[PDB]
């Protein structure tokens with residue numbers, strides 16, 4: 287697909303799908319009742335889109351999808367809502383699904399925004415967590431991979447809206463984003 | 465296991481869905497293989513085609529870009545809740561849909577996207593129902609021609625449920641009445 | 642004139658309203674003579690007429706921001722265009738009834754960390770006494786009856802009235 | 814007294830603007846006189862204008878707002894119309910038509926929703942609108958190409974609240 291753009295492969299597709307399977311079961315166990323309402327997966331477009339469709343099928347309990355679209359005002363990160371949730375999450379069991387957590391600013395904003403909507407419960411699942419995100423103010427119950435601070439693309443991760451479609455996660459060549 | 469007593473029968477198994485998407489991927493890949501230096505742009509309307517587009521994109525052997533539209537209902541009269549994140553002017557664009565039934569949404573979408581002047585505009589849907597086989601909008605890629613059964617699974621919903629299924633199943637009448 | 646038979650009685654005439662707004666503008670202008678302009682935040686659509694008249698009655702520089710919401714506790718359809726961090730902000734509302742909308746809005750804006758946050762409503766109804774958000778500026782206190790005009794609607798109609806009046810029971 | 818030293822001269826006073834809007838409303842009211850006339854505005858330069866105009870139009874009128882933004886002459890819709898304008902008499906309301914590209918987009922977008930009638934009212938029109946192709950049934954004032962602020966018109970979000978329209982002195986830029 288992208289010859290000369292990917293410097294190396296950090297996480298193979300097989301590794302990714304394997305980890306999601308275990309995350310899927312672990313999440314399935316923790317959420318396996320009294321409420322009668324399905325688990326609610328909340329995704330912020332669009333880097334976590336590939337991840338959430340796979341995670342959802344790996345979680346052995348019913349799961350609903352909800353999507354948020356956001357933009358930055360510039361420089362918890364300060365965040366503008368382009369598309370709000372389609373439904374009220376009041377009293378719902380909610381799982382935030384992120385592609386990567388780096389600074390922690392987005393997730394910090396998201397956790398607060400969703401909290402004041404008063405869900406029954408709020409937890410966080412991220413496929414990737416970078417070193418600066420370890421020891422952050424928002425608790426992340428489910429972490430797929432603890433990765434180094436390398437700029438990576440693939441499996442939903444982009445540089446300039448490219449490389450999102452890769453099935454694996456690879457380190458991008460410094461030439462590309464110079 | 466997930467929804468016991470709700471699925472009346474399986475219309476399309478997961479193995480069958482992934483198989484057809486593999487063929488679709490190749491077929492799409494060869495067409496758009498045939499200078500511009502810009503990637504193929506996949507455009508999805510949330511939320512039912514979300515699962516489909518993430519599989520299709522990985523099955524298409526040429527670079528693909530993701531864009532998402534969110535719409536709502538008030539000729540297909542449609543309200544936009546979230547416009548495209550970028551200008552698609554001069555881009556080669558593939559509309560990705562979960563199901564085409566009356567063809568009303570697709571008519572609205574095709575014309576809405578046409579006036580943004582893309583280089584090209586084609587449509588790919590996983591499912592097509594009888595009433596849509598002779599609709600005014602041309603669909604270059606059809607995964608399956610299914611009957612007019614109300615189906616769920618693989619992105620398809622009833623009251624926001626059943627989207628997470630890996631297969632496409634017919635839903636029991638008790639559930640939606 | 643515009644809607645014959647639809648308005649049972651006038652509540653607030655055009656002149657009553659503009660005079661009150663002239664007063665409000667002066668009171669707000671005195672309070673905010675503080676280096677960024679006062680930021681008026683309005684929720685569409687009811688307070689649109691009000692906020693355009695109010696902004697012109699305020700003798701200090703004022704900027705406009707609009708939000709668009711919808712009830713599912715409300716869904717944001719159009720967010721603010723700018724980071725209100727460090728800004729002096731005035732929420733402008735048409736009517737405060739149950740107070741729930743103001744409650745949500747107040748909390749939403751507060752977590753964006755403005756320097757100051759106050760509320761101005763044209764109309765306050767009796768049920769607002771059971772709400773908890775402080776309102777620095779009130780145009781008029783009115784009874785419980787459903788009113789239309791000056792931005793207030795019944796099924797999108799009557800917003801263009803220059804006065805506020807009670808709706809005839811025949812319309813329901 | 815609002816922005817001391819920023820305005821070099823007044824182009825259109827508050828009184829002059831209101832008088833013209835009064836004429837506009839009557840003219841528009843006469844033309845449209847069983848569903849209410851729909852005024853459609855793009856946020857937010859024309860908000861002041863549309864609130865005054867709606868009150869000056871002696872027929873029942875309704876408001877609908879749109880919010881757009883430029884993709885980094887086509888625009889991104891941020892807030893769409895709240896209602897279906899199918900079979901409705903629609904009047905687009907603008908603050909200023911300059912290049913005509915904004916109005917060009919908006920007019921095409923609303924046409925495809927099939928209103929019964931579509932017309933354009935703008936408070937101000939600049940000389941370059943002569944090459945815009947899109948017809949305007951109601952113009953408040955034809956004005957020079959010079960940059961003006963006030964009555965909804967901004968310079969980096971300032972000066973919108975002015976009751977009059979005026980010229981900024983080059984010190985501001």
Ligand SMILES: O=c1nc[nH]c2c1ncn2CCN(CCN(CCP(=O)(O)O)CCP(=O)(O)O)CCP(=O)(O)O
Pocket residue numbers: 330331332333334356357358363386387388389390391392393419436437438439443444445
């Ligand atoms: O390695 C990486 N490869 C790609 N992206 C990366 C990487 N690391 C951080 N990021 C950016 C992710 N961060 C910003 C994400 N988002 C904000 C982009 P912006 O609004 O332009 O500042 C991108 C949305 P999308 O999925 O559509 O690309 C959020 C993590 P945090 O710093 O808030 O904890």
Ligand SMILES: O=c1nc[nH]c2c1ncn2CCN(CCN(CCP(=O)(O)O)CCP(=O)(O)O)CCP(=O)(O)O
Pocket residue numbers: 509510511512513536537563564565566567568569570596613614615616620621622
């Ligand atoms: O078998 C089905 N199972 C689930 N849904 C089905 C089925 N058939 C049609 N549909 C509904 C598909 N519809 C797609 C969009 N629908 C919502 C998109 P989604 O978020 O993916 O569920 C309906 C819009 P609204 O409910 O607001 O009127 C219209 C297809 P068309 O008739 O315009 O060609």
Ligand SMILES: O=c1nc[nH]c2c1ncn2CCN(CCN(CCP(=O)(O)O)CCP(=O)(O)O)CCP(=O)(O)O
Pocket residue numbers: 684685686687688711712736737738739740741742743766786787788789793794795
């Ligand atoms: O007399 C009245 N005349 C018109 N409207 C009236 C009146 N009283 C309450 N209301 C409704 C005001 N409500 C405003 C909320 N908005 C939500 C209306 P809905 O989506 O139908 O629930 C109004 C949107 P708009 O400005 O477009 O008309 C609630 C204020 P509060 O109860 O949270 O304090």
Ligand SMILES: O=c1nc[nH]c2c1ncn2CCN(CCN(CCP(=O)(O)O)CCP(=O)(O)O)CCP(=O)(O)O
Pocket residue numbers: 855856857858859883909910911912913914915916959960961962966967968
């Ligand atoms: O004298 C003027 N004073 C203020 N603004 C002026 C003036 N002349 C043109 N303009 C810009 C008006 N422009 C209106 C579009 N918008 C410009 C977007 P931007 O590219 O970010 O400056 C205005 C949004 P708002 O109403 O919120 O301020 C373009 C009109 P047109 O060239 O498409 O016919």
Ligand SMILES: [Mg+2]
Pocket residue numbers: 330333334384385386
């Ligand atoms: Mg993310």
Ligand SMILES: [Mg+2]
Pocket residue numbers: 333443444445446
């Ligand atoms: Mg990114």
Ligand SMILES: [Mg+2]
Pocket residue numbers: 509512513561562563
């Ligand atoms: Mg669809």
Ligand SMILES: [Mg+2]
Pocket residue numbers: 621622
């Ligand atoms: Mg549906």
Ligand SMILES: [Mg+2]
Pocket residue numbers: 684687688734735736
């Ligand atoms: Mg209000």
Ligand SMILES: [Mg+2]
Pocket residue numbers: 793794795796
């Ligand atoms: Mg109302």
Ligand SMILES: [Mg+2]
Pocket residue numbers: 855858859907908909
């Ligand atoms: Mg304008």
Ligand SMILES: [Mg+2]
Pocket residue numbers: 967968969970
């Ligand atoms: Mg401007």
